[PDB]
Ligand binder design. Structure first.
Ligand SMILES: *[C@](O)(OCC/C(C)=C\C(=O)N(C)O)[C@H](CCCN(O)C(=O)CC)NC(C)=O
Ligand SMILES: [Fe+3]
Ligand SMILES: [Fe+3]
Lengths: 279, 282
């Protein structure tokens, strides 16, 4: 039995690389044509890994009291079989260009161009009767790095950026350069949502785990520095002229993988129902 | 030419209870399996009530664990829902199925024992039949709101029925805190584990944008009466140092409401039960 009120299709970028675009719309709709007028839309990178959660989370909002009509979910993924991630494809698509970056990295701007010039029009054609009230870009890990990169380099492209556990550590904190250029530049501003799990930088010991293995995980966690890097960036963006609102959340007892469920669920909830955010 | 979205490594089937009331059972298994009959040996299983609302989240969250370091083959998801179209809840059915029996309960309530019997005597065998080569290593019961009230009711009245009980934002308020009677009886008389959770904005909701004060005060009135966080903490406090409880985990999710927290609790629930068993003696 297929998912209700959803569809998927393949788009190729300008270089002939395929993408699986998965789309869902409010469950109470009979057809796609049911929806009229302005609706919010969210674009989710690593689409395969999060489409179903974001879809069901959006449907669950129908029962909530602050439901305003819902919005369109767009998951941008890859053709996969028996797994949720394409390590090779995402490594290029989600990381910004740098001089010292190894091969198969630094294709963020190519991928963002694809989203704006291919995915957005394609989805808009599937809903001719509706207009895009506002657009959100969600990503987790390298996806979050892409979200931050998109904000700092093309802030007008999207209304809201949602960086779930962003890989700020990547490439000797290259994103902090762009963050500095963003704040130092002086000039409606978009919003930013940052989040991370509490067990990312400070993980507890597993039931089966021994000391050496645990110490190795702690050393890794310390190097990646998920929470502190995010706070450093958030403190850096505090009182910025080019940013309307900045929301930051720490999810208690959540690891890098588990927090994805929380961040994507709240991300679209806030964006759909609680727009605009207070300063 | 767009197509419908297929859900891989999953199937659904309908079951009747003894009373002849229909249920939609939705099952999923690890994504890396070629077939349903790929897996063998002991695997953990989680039963999720209000199945329609939580199946896809639990399914995909379980699949996401494959990428994590602490993956141990995964487990089986079982969502116990209803035949529905255009919504994720059946208010009438769930009102009966998820609430315990009391003398002062209105019409259409107090059918928890009927539903729990259905889970043990119908759902469990039906799932076991579909996975012959799999043995049920351990069983968890998850529920949210009334579902959490059912999970607590199940723990206090039939503790040996499941190994782990996960109560997400349990409706302890229901029927003048009638669950506290069962809770008191339980403590006063190995052991199963309990996972309790709630959202921070449930009992203390912030004001929405362009919300009239009158409307906001009405929401605060409800929040105060339902007393989600305090009731849960009060119940947890009572159960602490109980002989018939191995471990008790309690979490509060920052900036989460009654609906949104469901995503977190179900994800946390299956994660810990699948990967971090057995729990520390807390
Ligand atoms: C971020 O992208 O984490 C997500 C990793 C995912 C979704 C899948 C995966 O890792 N698979 C299938 O192997 C980054 C990724 C960093 C690159 N990496 O895989 C490393 O191992 C790096 C030491 N990770 C974080 C923690 O931000
Ligand atoms: Fe890796
Ligand atoms: Fe209600």
């Amino acid at each position: 039995v297929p998912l209700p009120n959803s569809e998927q299709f393949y788009l190729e970028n300008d270089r002939g690389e395929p993408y699986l675009i998965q789309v869902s719309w409010p469950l109470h709709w009979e057809d796609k044509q049911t929806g009229r007028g302005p609706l919010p839309i969210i674009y989710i990178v690593d689409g395969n890994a999060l489409f179903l959660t974001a879809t069901e989370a959006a449907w669950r909002r129908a029962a909530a009291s602050h439901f305003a009509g819902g919005g369109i979910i767009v998951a941008i993924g890859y053709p996969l079989k028996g797994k949720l991630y394409d390590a090779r494809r995402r490594s290029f698509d989600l990381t910004p260009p740098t001089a010292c970056a190894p091969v198969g990295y630094g294709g963020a701007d190519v991928f963002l161009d694809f989203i704006e010039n291919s995915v957005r029009p394609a989805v808009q054609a599937r809903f001719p009767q509706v207009s895009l009230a506002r657009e959100a870009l969600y990503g987790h890990s390298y996806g979050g790095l892409l979200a931050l990169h998109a904000l700092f380099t093309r802030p007008q492209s999207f209304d809201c950026y949602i960086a779930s556990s962003p890989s700020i550590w990547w490439n000797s904190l290259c994103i902090l350069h762009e963050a500095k250029a963003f704040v130092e530049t002086k000039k409606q501003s978009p919003s930013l949502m940052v989040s991370w799990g509490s067990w990312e930088q400070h993980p507890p010991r597993w039931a089966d785990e021994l000391l050496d293995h645990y110490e190795a995980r702690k050393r890794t966690a310390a190097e990646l520095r998920m929470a502190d890097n995010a706070l450093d960036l958030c403190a850096m963006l505090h009182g910025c002229s080019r940013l309307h609102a900045l929301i930051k959340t720490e999810y208690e007892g959540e690891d890098h993988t588990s927090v994805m469920s929380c961040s994507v669920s709240r991300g679209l909830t806030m964006f759909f129902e609680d727009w605009p955010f207070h300063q």
